[PDB]
Every structure is written in structure tokens, then in C-alpha cells.
Amino acid sequence: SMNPPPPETSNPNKPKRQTNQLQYLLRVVLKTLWKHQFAWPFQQPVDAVKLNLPDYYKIIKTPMDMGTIKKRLENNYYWNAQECIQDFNTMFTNCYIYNKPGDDIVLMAEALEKLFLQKINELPTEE
Template identity: 45%
Template sequence: MIGVTGHKWAGPFMQPVDVVGLGLHDYYEIIEKPMDFSTIKNKMEAKDGSGYKNVREICADVRLIFKNAMKYNDERNDVHVMAKTLLAKFEEKWLLLLPKVDEEEERRKKEEAEAQLDIQLAQEVSHAKMAKELNTELDVIGKRLEKMRETVLRNCRKMSTEEKKALMTVLTQLSPDDLNKALLIVAENNPSFQATGQEVDLDIDAQSESTLWKLKFFVKDLLQSQGKSPTSIGGNTTTTTVNNNNQNKRKRETNDGPAKPSQKKNKKPS
């Protein structure tokens, strides 16, 4: 251990103190942690993870060997003198070795930091891959759900005349942004429908059942998000619809405002 174990006085410190053989009945009362060079050697060679983590830990145990001997034995005792002499020689050797120890520690810290960075980058790549795969799966699920929704809408019952009137009433009361969203729903299934202009002529009876139900679900969700009752999409509201249309038309003529749907009157069955 840095040249100390080869010294002629190293013998008493090579093996654990024979407490029983030497009759040192108070040894463990004075020495809290016994130490010797054979114990240090075994710990250096340990393969189970219980060994030293760095040179400084070894150095601390070497010091402990000599400090234990000096603590237990009187200053005039030969063992005390031998321990004190060997400790001084050890400190001299340690000072010479210290720059290399510092250099080695810096190198290890750098390697550990680089290894940690590599692990972090690998984890980020893995997480990015997982996120991409998850997004792909969600897209597939979303498309399937949309197809299922389209199927459900195609098989919906026919909307009644009263329901159409109520739906038209709600549409005329929407904000410009929400109205544009509703008109885009109509345009999705009706390429010839023009969702632009100061006044949009929306023939509610000419729309497919799936378009009508999409509009109803849209305004229902919209009303719920605004804290209003979805039941407002129902009942006999023909008069209200006409009044709202007339008011909207007057506003457009005066303020050149956003587009509003105009309701075509439903034909009475013959």
C-alpha cells in the first residue's frame, strides 16, 4: 500500500489484532473499527460490490490502521512508535501520489458524465420513438372511429320537420365563428355548397340525414360547452326562425356583417 507494507515495521499491522491471544480485553471498547492491511486487500479484491469505490477510501483505511494502534497503545509503546513512523512515511508517499489521484478522478468524472449523457440521449430517442408510434396508433384509431361515426350517421333515423326547424333556429343564433364551422360541415358532404358570402342560402330540407345529424351534434356540443341546455334544439320555433332571419338580413344590409343562413320554407306534405 504505497510502499508501506514492505517496511520492516509493517508486520504488526498486516493481520487483524489477535485480541484473545494477546489478552486485550478492552480493545473493542477503545477501538470502534479495527483495521489491518489484509482486510484492506480483501476489500480491494471483492467482487460483490462491497469493495472500495475510489483510492481515497483506501487511503482512509490505511490511516485508520496506524491511528488505531496509536490510540490503543501508549506513546512509549513500540507499536505506537512504529505506527506513528509508518503513518508519516505514508503521508509523504500520498502527497506525491495525490496529483495523479486528482487527475484520475477528473477523468472518471468526465467519463461518467459522458456515459450519463449517452444514457439520457438514448432514453430521449426511445421516448420519441414511442411517442411517434403512439401517435400513429392514435391516428389509426381516430380514422376507425370516424368511419364508425359515419356509419352510425348514415343509419340514423330521419330528422323530423320540427327538429329541422329547431336546428335552423339555433344556427341563425350562432356567433360568426361558430356559424362558419357549421357551414363547413355542410360543405364537407355537399361540394357544390358555397359557405362564403354575405348571405348563405341554406336549404335545410336538401341536406342529407348524416349532414343534419352532424349539425345537430355540433350545436348540441356547442350549447353544452356554453352551459346551455341542448333541449333548445327542439319544439315548434318556426316564427322565431323567420324573425331571426329577418333581423340577420337587416344587419347584413346595414353593417355588411358576416354570413348568415337563410331558411328555405319547408314544403307541406300534399
């Protein structure tokens, strides 16, 4: 059961912007989660072949990970902050959909999500 191609991170025809909110999502939100001790399972797309999870991409149909988010922010791929915030939320929700309460991977996502929520609570107003 192969891995699908990763989510898109480059598209020259996509309208995109650099807003102060998107700068905050890279410089504060992404950077804080990325350096966390629990970040590594989320730093790249799930390799469901190497992890022996043949059902993963049959259940998770909108995959997302912080490696993809990092590339999108570095490429200024987004139009607005909500688009990027949705990518984070997709990543967390996907984790809770696929896994069981109290699993190690869920505990790791919950720690990252708590920090995520604390940082987006202080999202600056758009200038």
C-alpha cells in the same frame, strides 16, 4: 472477550471501481508499507485473545489493518481513493487511541505513517 468478525472485504452489491489512484494505492502505497520491517503487527486484524487484550475491541470500535486493506484493494472493493486512504488513517489513529506515546507499537505505526504520507503526497491526478 472474543474477537469480532473481521471487516468486510467482499460485497458483490457494493458499487466499486478500478481507478488509477486506487491502482497507485495498491502498487505503491500498500506494497511499500507491507514490505517494511515494522509492517507485521499491522498485516492482519489484532488477535486480542492471543495478545491478552480483552479491552481492545471494547475500545477500538472501527478496527482496520493492512491485511484487510490488501484484500479490499485486490478485490477492487473500493469506489474511490479516499475510501482506501481513510482505512489507512483509521488504522493509524486506532493505534494512537489504544496505546501510549513512545510505545514500541506506536513507534512502528509512526514509521509506517510517515511513509504513507510521503506516498500519498504523490497521489496521481485521477485520469
